[PDB]
Design a protein around this ligand. Structure first.
Ligand SMILES: *c1ncnc2c1ncn2[C@@H]1O[C@H](COP(=O)(O)O)[C@@H](O)[C@H]1O
Length: 124
């Protein structure tokens, strides 16, 4: 059904905007990409860059992943990212999120042929 590469795109890529335009961005996008369906996904990051430029991070600085595998790569440049974190008063099905827009380096894990991002590891 959905490959790891397409799930990465649905949960983490937002090429349509260059930044969140309002504090309401996370409540709208978490729901539109189905991250509120059987639970409220607690934290999620969206990258506001073109697919090609995020795909290119797979040949940049190789680092270890939080899980200890070494197929993770760190972007040389900072990227526009929007950080979404569930509020303390949030309870499924009424998922509420705080938005934080920033320019940060990302660390993604890559896999397959073509070798593409499949897991968002962290932003730094
Ligand atoms: C559809 N349903 C299950 N598995 C599929 C589908 N299309 C491709 N696959 C394969 O299993 C992985 C699904 O993504 P993850 O949830 O494991 O990250 C794909 O990478 C593909 O190998």
């Amino acid at each position: 059904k959905e490959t790891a590469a397409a799930k990465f795109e649905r949960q983490h890529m937002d090429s349509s905007t260059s930044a969140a335009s309002s504090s309401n961005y996370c409540n709208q996008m978490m729901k539109s990409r189905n991250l509120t369906k059987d639970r409220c996904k607690p934290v999620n990051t969206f990258v506001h860059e073109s697919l090609a430029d995020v795909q290119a991070v797979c040949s940049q600085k190789n680092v270890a992943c939080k899980n200890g595998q070494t197929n993770c790569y760190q972007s040389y440049s900072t990227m526009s990212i929007t950080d979404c974190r569930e509020t303390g008063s949030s309870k499924y099905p009424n998922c509420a999120y705080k938005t934080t827009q920033a320019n940060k380096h990302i660390i993604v894990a890559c896999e397959g042929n073509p070798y593409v991002p499949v897991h968002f590891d962290a932003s730094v």
